[PDB]
mmCIF file of all heavy atoms in Angstrom:
data_model
loop_
_atom_site.group_PDB
_atom_site.id
_atom_site.type_symbol
_atom_site.label_atom_id
_atom_site.label_comp_id
_atom_site.label_asym_id
_atom_site.label_seq_id
_atom_site.Cartn_x
_atom_site.Cartn_y
_atom_site.Cartn_z
ATOM 1 N N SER A 1 -34.531 -4.123 -6.849
ATOM 2 C CA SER A 1 -34.972 -3.898 -8.244
ATOM 3 C C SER A 1 -34.781 -2.414 -8.568
ATOM 4 O O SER A 1 -34.738 -1.598 -7.631
ATOM 5 C CB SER A 1 -36.409 -4.291 -8.414
ATOM 6 O OG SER A 1 -37.225 -3.533 -7.537
ATOM 7 N N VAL A 2 -34.733 -2.061 -9.848
ATOM 8 C CA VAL A 2 -34.779 -0.635 -10.272
ATOM 9 C C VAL A 2 -35.965 0.049 -9.574
ATOM 10 O O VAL A 2 -35.763 1.138 -9.009
ATOM 11 C CB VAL A 2 -34.884 -0.526 -11.802
ATOM 12 C CG1 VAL A 2 -35.100 0.907 -12.268
ATOM 13 C CG2 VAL A 2 -33.649 -1.136 -12.458
ATOM 14 N N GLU A 3 -37.143 -0.582 -9.593
ATOM 15 C CA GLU A 3 -38.402 -0.018 -9.036
ATOM 16 C C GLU A 3 -38.172 0.422 -7.588
ATOM 17 O O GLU A 3 -38.633 1.497 -7.197
ATOM 18 C CB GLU A 3 -39.517 -1.067 -9.059
ATOM 19 C CG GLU A 3 -40.871 -0.517 -8.660
ATOM 20 C CD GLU A 3 -41.981 -1.528 -8.422
ATOM 21 O OE1 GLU A 3 -41.697 -2.696 -8.150
ATOM 22 O OE2 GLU A 3 -43.154 -1.122 -8.506
ATOM 23 N N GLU A 4 -37.466 -0.416 -6.824
ATOM 24 C CA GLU A 4 -37.330 -0.300 -5.346
ATOM 25 C C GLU A 4 -35.951 0.245 -4.958
ATOM 26 O O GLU A 4 -35.581 0.075 -3.784
ATOM 27 C CB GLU A 4 -37.570 -1.664 -4.698
ATOM 28 C CG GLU A 4 -38.945 -2.233 -4.986
ATOM 29 C CD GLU A 4 -39.294 -3.499 -4.225
ATOM 30 O OE1 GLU A 4 -38.377 -4.103 -3.628
ATOM 31 O OE2 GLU A 4 -40.482 -3.881 -4.228
ATOM 32 N N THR A 5 -35.218 0.870 -5.888
ATOM 33 C CA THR A 5 -33.922 1.547 -5.586
ATOM 34 C C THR A 5 -34.198 2.991 -5.149
ATOM 35 O O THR A 5 -34.850 3.716 -5.911
ATOM 36 C CB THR A 5 -32.949 1.526 -6.770
ATOM 37 O OG1 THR A 5 -32.774 0.180 -7.206
ATOM 38 C CG2 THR A 5 -31.601 2.114 -6.420
ATOM 39 N N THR A 6 -33.758 3.397 -3.956
ATOM 40 C CA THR A 6 -33.795 4.819 -3.529
ATOM 41 C C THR A 6 -32.696 5.572 -4.282
ATOM 42 O O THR A 6 -31.699 4.939 -4.699
ATOM 43 C CB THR A 6 -33.649 4.988 -2.013
ATOM 44 O OG1 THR A 6 -32.299 4.678 -1.673
ATOM 45 C CG2 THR A 6 -34.617 4.121 -1.234
ATOM 46 N N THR A 7 -32.859 6.876 -4.448
ATOM 47 C CA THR A 7 -31.850 7.731 -5.116
ATOM 48 C C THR A 7 -30.551 7.677 -4.299
ATOM 49 O O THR A 7 -29.493 7.661 -4.918
ATOM 50 C CB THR A 7 -32.402 9.134 -5.357
ATOM 51 O OG1 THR A 7 -33.520 8.949 -6.229
ATOM 52 C CG2 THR A 7 -31.390 10.066 -5.987
ATOM 53 N N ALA A 8 -30.632 7.644 -2.967
ATOM 54 C CA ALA A 8 -29.451 7.518 -2.080
ATOM 55 C C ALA A 8 -28.681 6.231 -2.419
ATOM 56 O O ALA A 8 -27.431 6.291 -2.556
ATOM 57 C CB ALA A 8 -29.877 7.548 -0.633
ATOM 58 N N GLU A 9 -29.391 5.106 -2.537
ATOM 59 C CA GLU A 9 -28.794 3.781 -2.864
ATOM 60 C C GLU A 9 -28.132 3.842 -4.242
ATOM 61 O O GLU A 9 -27.002 3.357 -4.397
ATOM 62 C CB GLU A 9 -29.855 2.683 -2.859
ATOM 63 C CG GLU A 9 -30.291 2.257 -1.471
ATOM 64 C CD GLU A 9 -31.470 1.299 -1.454
ATOM 65 O OE1 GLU A 9 -32.312 1.391 -2.362
ATOM 66 O OE2 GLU A 9 -31.539 0.453 -0.542
ATOM 67 N N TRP A 10 -28.842 4.414 -5.211
ATOM 68 C CA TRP A 10 -28.364 4.613 -6.602
ATOM 69 C C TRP A 10 -27.025 5.366 -6.596
ATOM 70 O O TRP A 10 -26.042 4.837 -7.145
ATOM 71 C CB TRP A 10 -29.457 5.348 -7.383
ATOM 72 C CG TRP A 10 -29.095 5.723 -8.783
ATOM 73 C CD1 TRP A 10 -28.662 6.941 -9.215
ATOM 74 C CD2 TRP A 10 -29.162 4.879 -9.943
ATOM 75 N NE1 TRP A 10 -28.464 6.916 -10.567
ATOM 76 C CE2 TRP A 10 -28.746 5.663 -11.039
ATOM 77 C CE3 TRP A 10 -29.514 3.543 -10.158
ATOM 78 C CZ2 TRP A 10 -28.689 5.154 -12.334
ATOM 79 C CZ3 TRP A 10 -29.449 3.034 -11.437
ATOM 80 C CH2 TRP A 10 -29.042 3.834 -12.506
ATOM 81 N N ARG A 11 -26.972 6.540 -5.960
ATOM 82 C CA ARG A 11 -25.756 7.400 -5.964
ATOM 83 C C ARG A 11 -24.617 6.718 -5.194
ATOM 84 O O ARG A 11 -23.489 6.833 -5.651
ATOM 85 C CB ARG A 11 -26.041 8.779 -5.369
ATOM 86 C CG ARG A 11 -27.074 9.576 -6.149
ATOM 87 C CD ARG A 11 -26.873 11.065 -5.980
ATOM 88 N NE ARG A 11 -27.991 11.783 -6.573
ATOM 89 C CZ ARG A 11 -28.159 11.993 -7.875
ATOM 90 N NH1 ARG A 11 -27.272 11.536 -8.749
ATOM 91 N NH2 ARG A 11 -29.225 12.656 -8.295
ATOM 92 N N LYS A 12 -24.904 6.064 -4.065
ATOM 93 C CA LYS A 12 -23.869 5.399 -3.221
ATOM 94 C C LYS A 12 -23.206 4.285 -4.036
ATOM 95 O O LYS A 12 -21.959 4.180 -4.041
ATOM 96 C CB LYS A 12 -24.502 4.834 -1.945
ATOM 97 C CG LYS A 12 -23.530 4.224 -0.948
ATOM 98 C CD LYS A 12 -24.218 3.448 0.159
ATOM 99 C CE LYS A 12 -23.245 2.719 1.060
ATOM 100 N NZ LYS A 12 -22.557 3.653 1.982
ATOM 101 N N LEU A 13 -24.007 3.476 -4.725
ATOM 102 C CA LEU A 13 -23.442 2.343 -5.495
ATOM 103 C C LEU A 13 -22.655 2.883 -6.692
ATOM 104 O O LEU A 13 -21.557 2.379 -6.956
ATOM 105 C CB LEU A 13 -24.538 1.369 -5.918
ATOM 106 C CG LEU A 13 -24.031 0.164 -6.707
ATOM 107 C CD1 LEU A 13 -24.798 -1.092 -6.348
ATOM 108 C CD2 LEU A 13 -24.086 0.425 -8.200
ATOM 109 N N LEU A 14 -23.194 3.844 -7.432
ATOM 110 C CA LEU A 14 -22.479 4.386 -8.620
ATOM 111 C C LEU A 14 -21.193 5.119 -8.201
ATOM 112 O O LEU A 14 -20.222 5.133 -8.990
ATOM 113 C CB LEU A 14 -23.450 5.276 -9.394
ATOM 114 C CG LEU A 14 -24.603 4.525 -10.059
ATOM 115 C CD1 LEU A 14 -25.503 5.495 -10.796
ATOM 116 C CD2 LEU A 14 -24.093 3.441 -10.996
ATOM 117 N N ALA A 15 -21.153 5.703 -7.004
ATOM 118 C CA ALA A 15 -19.948 6.404 -6.506
ATOM 119 C C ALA A 15 -18.754 5.436 -6.498
ATOM 120 O O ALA A 15 -17.681 5.817 -6.972
ATOM 121 C CB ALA A 15 -20.211 6.983 -5.137
ATOM 122 N N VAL A 16 -18.964 4.204 -6.045
ATOM 123 C CA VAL A 16 -17.899 3.160 -5.940
ATOM 124 C C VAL A 16 -17.767 2.457 -7.296
ATOM 125 O O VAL A 16 -16.653 2.429 -7.874
ATOM 126 C CB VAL A 16 -18.243 2.160 -4.822
ATOM 127 C CG1 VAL A 16 -17.243 1.018 -4.753
ATOM 128 C CG2 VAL A 16 -18.356 2.863 -3.479
ATOM 129 N N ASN A 17 -18.872 1.910 -7.790
ATOM 130 C CA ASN A 17 -18.853 0.914 -8.891
ATOM 131 C C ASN A 17 -18.641 1.594 -10.242
ATOM 132 O O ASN A 17 -18.245 0.893 -11.189
ATOM 133 C CB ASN A 17 -20.136 0.097 -8.963
ATOM 134 C CG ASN A 17 -20.328 -0.841 -7.799
ATOM 135 O OD1 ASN A 17 -19.643 -0.726 -6.779
ATOM 136 N ND2 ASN A 17 -21.247 -1.777 -7.957
ATOM 137 N N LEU A 18 -18.958 2.885 -10.363
ATOM 138 C CA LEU A 18 -18.807 3.586 -11.659
ATOM 139 C C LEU A 18 -17.826 4.758 -11.530
ATOM 140 O O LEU A 18 -16.787 4.732 -12.215
ATOM 141 C CB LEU A 18 -20.194 4.018 -12.133
ATOM 142 C CG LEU A 18 -20.205 4.791 -13.446
ATOM 143 C CD1 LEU A 18 -19.347 4.115 -14.503
ATOM 144 C CD2 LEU A 18 -21.629 4.969 -13.936
ATOM 145 N N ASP A 19 -18.126 5.763 -10.708
ATOM 146 C CA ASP A 19 -17.212 6.922 -10.520
ATOM 147 C C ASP A 19 -15.811 6.411 -10.153
ATOM 148 O O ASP A 19 -14.833 6.865 -10.770
ATOM 149 C CB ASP A 19 -17.732 7.891 -9.452
ATOM 150 C CG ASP A 19 -19.087 8.515 -9.757
ATOM 151 O OD1 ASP A 19 -19.544 8.404 -10.911
ATOM 152 O OD2 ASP A 19 -19.683 9.093 -8.824
ATOM 153 N N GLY A 20 -15.726 5.488 -9.196
ATOM 154 C CA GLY A 20 -14.443 4.954 -8.699
ATOM 155 C C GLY A 20 -13.633 4.329 -9.820
ATOM 156 O O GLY A 20 -12.413 4.566 -9.897
ATOM 157 N N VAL A 21 -14.300 3.576 -10.690
ATOM 158 C CA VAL A 21 -13.642 2.892 -11.833
ATOM 159 C C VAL A 21 -13.229 3.945 -12.863
ATOM 160 O O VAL A 21 -12.148 3.807 -13.439
ATOM 161 C CB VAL A 21 -14.542 1.801 -12.431
ATOM 162 C CG1 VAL A 21 -13.873 1.113 -13.611
ATOM 163 C CG2 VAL A 21 -14.959 0.784 -11.375
ATOM 164 N N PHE A 22 -14.079 4.943 -13.125
ATOM 165 C CA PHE A 22 -13.717 6.088 -13.999
ATOM 166 C C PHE A 22 -12.468 6.793 -13.444
ATOM 167 O O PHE A 22 -11.499 7.039 -14.201
ATOM 168 C CB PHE A 22 -14.923 7.014 -14.175
ATOM 169 C CG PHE A 22 -14.563 8.366 -14.719
ATOM 170 C CD1 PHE A 22 -14.065 8.493 -16.006
ATOM 171 C CD2 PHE A 22 -14.705 9.512 -13.947
ATOM 172 C CE1 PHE A 22 -13.721 9.736 -16.513
ATOM 173 C CE2 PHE A 22 -14.359 10.753 -14.457
ATOM 174 C CZ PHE A 22 -13.856 10.861 -15.733
ATOM 175 N N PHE A 23 -12.484 7.130 -12.158
ATOM 176 C CA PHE A 23 -11.359 7.856 -11.511
ATOM 177 C C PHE A 23 -10.070 7.036 -11.643
ATOM 178 O O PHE A 23 -9.046 7.594 -12.044
ATOM 179 C CB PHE A 23 -11.631 8.136 -10.031
ATOM 180 C CG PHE A 23 -12.770 9.075 -9.735
ATOM 181 C CD1 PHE A 23 -13.455 8.978 -8.537
ATOM 182 C CD2 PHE A 23 -13.151 10.062 -10.632
ATOM 183 C CE1 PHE A 23 -14.488 9.850 -8.235
ATOM 184 C CE2 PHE A 23 -14.190 10.932 -10.333
ATOM 185 C CZ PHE A 23 -14.868 10.811 -9.145
ATOM 186 N N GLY A 24 -10.142 5.736 -11.378
ATOM 187 C CA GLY A 24 -8.966 4.854 -11.476
ATOM 188 C C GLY A 24 -8.511 4.719 -12.921
ATOM 189 O O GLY A 24 -7.316 4.822 -13.190
ATOM 190 N N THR A 25 -9.440 4.539 -13.862
ATOM 191 C CA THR A 25 -9.071 4.341 -15.284
ATOM 192 C C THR A 25 -8.429 5.617 -15.842
ATOM 193 O O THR A 25 -7.419 5.516 -16.556
ATOM 194 C CB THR A 25 -10.277 3.913 -16.125
ATOM 195 O OG1 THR A 25 -10.802 2.705 -15.568
ATOM 196 C CG2 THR A 25 -9.906 3.727 -17.577
ATOM 197 N N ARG A 26 -9.047 6.773 -15.597
ATOM 198 C CA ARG A 26 -8.570 8.075 -16.130
ATOM 199 C C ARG A 26 -7.155 8.335 -15.598
ATOM 200 O O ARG A 26 -6.248 8.607 -16.408
ATOM 201 C CB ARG A 26 -9.558 9.187 -15.762
ATOM 202 C CG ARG A 26 -9.124 10.573 -16.216
ATOM 203 C CD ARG A 26 -10.035 11.678 -15.713
ATOM 204 N NE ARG A 26 -10.005 11.767 -14.259
ATOM 205 C CZ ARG A 26 -10.851 12.471 -13.514
ATOM 206 N NH1 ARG A 26 -11.814 13.181 -14.079
ATOM 207 N NH2 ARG A 26 -10.729 12.454 -12.197
ATOM 208 N N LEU A 27 -6.970 8.240 -14.286
ATOM 209 C CA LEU A 27 -5.655 8.518 -13.658
ATOM 210 C C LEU A 27 -4.638 7.472 -14.131
ATOM 211 O O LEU A 27 -3.505 7.856 -14.461
ATOM 212 C CB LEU A 27 -5.793 8.527 -12.132
ATOM 213 C CG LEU A 27 -4.503 8.886 -11.389
ATOM 214 C CD1 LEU A 27 -3.972 10.240 -11.851
ATOM 215 C CD2 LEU A 27 -4.728 8.872 -9.888
ATOM 216 N N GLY A 28 -5.047 6.211 -14.226
ATOM 217 C CA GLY A 28 -4.172 5.130 -14.721
ATOM 218 C C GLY A 28 -3.638 5.439 -16.111
ATOM 219 O O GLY A 28 -2.459 5.284 -16.337
ATOM 220 N N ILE A 29 -4.483 5.889 -17.037
ATOM 221 C CA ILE A 29 -4.025 6.185 -18.423
ATOM 222 C C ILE A 29 -2.999 7.317 -18.334
ATOM 223 O O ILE A 29 -1.931 7.206 -18.952
ATOM 224 C CB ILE A 29 -5.216 6.541 -19.333
ATOM 225 C CG1 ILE A 29 -6.147 5.343 -19.515
ATOM 226 C CG2 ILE A 29 -4.726 7.083 -20.668
ATOM 227 C CD1 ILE A 29 -7.523 5.715 -20.012
ATOM 228 N N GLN A 30 -3.323 8.356 -17.573
ATOM 229 C CA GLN A 30 -2.480 9.571 -17.461
ATOM 230 C C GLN A 30 -1.090 9.190 -16.924
ATOM 231 O O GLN A 30 -0.077 9.640 -17.495
ATOM 232 C CB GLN A 30 -3.205 10.601 -16.592
ATOM 233 C CG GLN A 30 -4.404 11.224 -17.293
ATOM 234 C CD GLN A 30 -5.229 12.068 -16.351
ATOM 235 O OE1 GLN A 30 -5.009 12.093 -15.148
ATOM 236 N NE2 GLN A 30 -6.216 12.757 -16.894
ATOM 237 N N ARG A 31 -1.052 8.367 -15.883
ATOM 238 C CA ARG A 31 0.174 8.051 -15.111
ATOM 239 C C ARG A 31 0.960 6.888 -15.726
ATOM 240 O O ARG A 31 2.153 6.786 -15.421
ATOM 241 C CB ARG A 31 -0.200 7.716 -13.663
ATOM 242 C CG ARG A 31 -0.885 8.840 -12.896
ATOM 243 C CD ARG A 31 0.032 9.977 -12.523
ATOM 244 N NE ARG A 31 -0.613 10.969 -11.665
ATOM 245 C CZ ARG A 31 -0.338 11.177 -10.375
ATOM 246 N NH1 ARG A 31 0.585 10.459 -9.751
ATOM 247 N NH2 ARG A 31 -0.979 12.125 -9.707
ATOM 248 N N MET A 32 0.355 6.039 -16.554
ATOM 249 C CA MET A 32 1.029 4.800 -17.023
ATOM 250 C C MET A 32 1.319 4.823 -18.532
ATOM 251 O O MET A 32 2.077 3.954 -18.986
ATOM 252 C CB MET A 32 0.208 3.567 -16.645
ATOM 253 C CG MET A 32 -0.110 3.496 -15.166
ATOM 254 S SD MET A 32 -0.693 1.852 -14.681
ATOM 255 C CE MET A 32 -2.420 1.973 -15.138
ATOM 256 N N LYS A 33 0.745 5.752 -19.298
ATOM 257 C CA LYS A 33 1.011 5.820 -20.758
ATOM 258 C C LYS A 33 2.460 6.216 -21.060
ATOM 259 O O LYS A 33 3.060 6.979 -20.277
ATOM 260 C CB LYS A 33 0.081 6.820 -21.443
ATOM 261 C CG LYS A 33 0.316 8.284 -21.109
ATOM 262 C CD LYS A 33 -0.685 9.187 -21.764
ATOM 263 C CE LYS A 33 -0.459 10.653 -21.461
ATOM 264 N NZ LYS A 33 -1.380 11.527 -22.233
ATOM 265 N N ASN A 34 2.962 5.720 -22.196
ATOM 266 C CA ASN A 34 4.177 6.202 -22.900
ATOM 267 C C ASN A 34 5.402 5.996 -22.003
ATOM 268 O O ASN A 34 6.302 6.856 -22.034
ATOM 269 C CB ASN A 34 4.048 7.670 -23.319
ATOM 270 C CG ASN A 34 2.920 7.896 -24.299
ATOM 271 O OD1 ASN A 34 2.622 7.023 -25.106
ATOM 272 N ND2 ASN A 34 2.305 9.064 -24.242
ATOM 273 N N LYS A 35 5.434 4.918 -21.218
ATOM 274 C CA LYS A 35 6.551 4.661 -20.274
ATOM 275 C C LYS A 35 7.153 3.276 -20.537
ATOM 276 O O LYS A 35 8.067 2.899 -19.786
ATOM 277 C CB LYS A 35 6.057 4.863 -18.838
ATOM 278 C CG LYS A 35 5.970 6.320 -18.399
ATOM 279 C CD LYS A 35 5.266 6.561 -17.072
ATOM 280 C CE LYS A 35 5.266 8.034 -16.695
ATOM 281 N NZ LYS A 35 4.414 8.315 -15.516
ATOM 282 N N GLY A 36 6.738 2.588 -21.607
ATOM 283 C CA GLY A 36 7.224 1.239 -21.965
ATOM 284 C C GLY A 36 7.007 0.233 -20.848
ATOM 285 O O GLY A 36 7.794 -0.725 -20.753
ATOM 286 N N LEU A 37 5.981 0.433 -20.020
ATOM 287 C CA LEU A 37 5.686 -0.442 -18.856
ATOM 288 C C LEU A 37 4.899 -1.684 -19.274
ATOM 289 O O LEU A 37 4.752 -2.578 -18.430
ATOM 290 C CB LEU A 37 4.912 0.352 -17.804
ATOM 291 C CG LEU A 37 5.652 1.542 -17.203
ATOM 292 C CD1 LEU A 37 4.700 2.399 -16.389
ATOM 293 C CD2 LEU A 37 6.829 1.091 -16.352
ATOM 294 N N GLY A 38 4.367 -1.732 -20.499
ATOM 295 C CA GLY A 38 3.372 -2.756 -20.863
ATOM 296 C C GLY A 38 2.190 -2.643 -19.921
ATOM 297 O O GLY A 38 1.830 -3.627 -19.257
ATOM 298 N N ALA A 39 1.605 -1.447 -19.857
ATOM 299 C CA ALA A 39 0.615 -1.099 -18.825
ATOM 300 C C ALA A 39 -0.721 -1.774 -19.151
ATOM 301 O O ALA A 39 -1.065 -1.994 -20.348
ATOM 302 C CB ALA A 39 0.494 0.394 -18.682
ATOM 303 N N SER A 40 -1.436 -2.131 -18.096
ATOM 304 C CA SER A 40 -2.686 -2.916 -18.200
ATOM 305 C C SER A 40 -3.647 -2.439 -17.123
ATOM 306 O O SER A 40 -3.282 -2.451 -15.947
ATOM 307 C CB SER A 40 -2.395 -4.392 -18.110
ATOM 308 O OG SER A 40 -3.575 -5.157 -18.313
ATOM 309 N N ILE A 41 -4.837 -2.004 -17.551
ATOM 310 C CA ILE A 41 -5.963 -1.674 -16.640
ATOM 311 C C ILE A 41 -6.988 -2.787 -16.781
ATOM 312 O O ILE A 41 -7.484 -3.008 -17.901
ATOM 313 C CB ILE A 41 -6.548 -0.290 -16.936
ATOM 314 C CG1 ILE A 41 -5.462 0.781 -16.812
ATOM 315 C CG2 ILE A 41 -7.734 -0.022 -16.033
ATOM 316 C CD1 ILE A 41 -5.887 2.142 -17.278
ATOM 317 N N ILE A 42 -7.272 -3.451 -15.674
ATOM 318 C CA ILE A 42 -8.252 -4.561 -15.588
ATOM 319 C C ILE A 42 -9.435 -4.043 -14.783
ATOM 320 O O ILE A 42 -9.295 -3.828 -13.566
ATOM 321 C CB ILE A 42 -7.617 -5.801 -14.948
ATOM 322 C CG1 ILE A 42 -6.406 -6.292 -15.746
ATOM 323 C CG2 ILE A 42 -8.680 -6.869 -14.776
ATOM 324 C CD1 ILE A 42 -5.501 -7.251 -14.996
ATOM 325 N N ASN A 43 -10.554 -3.807 -15.465
ATOM 326 C CA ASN A 43 -11.772 -3.294 -14.802
ATOM 327 C C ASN A 43 -12.643 -4.491 -14.467
ATOM 328 O O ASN A 43 -13.078 -5.210 -15.384
ATOM 329 C CB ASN A 43 -12.444 -2.224 -15.645
ATOM 330 C CG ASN A 43 -11.649 -0.940 -15.603
ATOM 331 O OD1 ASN A 43 -10.828 -0.739 -14.700
ATOM 332 N ND2 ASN A 43 -11.845 -0.081 -16.585
ATOM 333 N N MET A 44 -12.800 -4.731 -13.172
ATOM 334 C CA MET A 44 -13.613 -5.852 -12.676
ATOM 335 C C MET A 44 -15.068 -5.504 -12.970
ATOM 336 O O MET A 44 -15.535 -4.423 -12.618
ATOM 337 C CB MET A 44 -13.398 -6.110 -11.186
ATOM 338 C CG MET A 44 -13.896 -7.465 -10.732
ATOM 339 S SD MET A 44 -13.089 -8.853 -11.570
ATOM 340 C CE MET A 44 -11.361 -8.523 -11.245
ATOM 341 N N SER A 45 -15.720 -6.392 -13.681
ATOM 342 C CA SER A 45 -17.172 -6.360 -13.910
ATOM 343 C C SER A 45 -17.718 -7.652 -13.313
ATOM 344 O O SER A 45 -17.147 -8.165 -12.330
ATOM 345 C CB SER A 45 -17.445 -6.202 -15.379
ATOM 346 O OG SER A 45 -18.822 -5.985 -15.643
ATOM 347 N N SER A 46 -18.753 -8.193 -13.917
ATOM 348 C CA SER A 46 -19.365 -9.462 -13.496
ATOM 349 C C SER A 46 -20.310 -9.909 -14.603
ATOM 350 O O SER A 46 -20.485 -9.183 -15.596
ATOM 351 C CB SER A 46 -20.084 -9.285 -12.189
ATOM 352 O OG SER A 46 -21.195 -8.437 -12.380
#
């Protein structure tokens, strides 16, 4: 639960599930734009 989440657990999960997706999305836009690739970023949620 939010109540029972340690700050360590919070940062570890956000490092992968949020920072990681930000890092992939940002770099993906930079590297795949304006190249006529029909580029597609699919962000897995749930």
Side-chain angles (χ1 to χ4, degrees):
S1 59
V2 173
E3 187 190 22
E4 300 187 347
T5 306
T6 71
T7 298
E9 284 172 329
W10 176 261
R11 298 207 188 282
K12 185 191 174 75
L13 181 143
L14 292 180
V16 175
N17 292 14
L18 178 47
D19 299 347
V21 179
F22 164 66
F23 295 153
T25 302
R26 178 186 64 192
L27 183 56
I29 295 162
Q30 288 171 352
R31 299 288 186 110
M32 306 195 277
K33 69 183 181 174
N34 298 328
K35 281 170 178 171
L37 297 169
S40 185
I41 302 172
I42 301 164
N43 287 341
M44 196 60 55
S45 188
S46 67

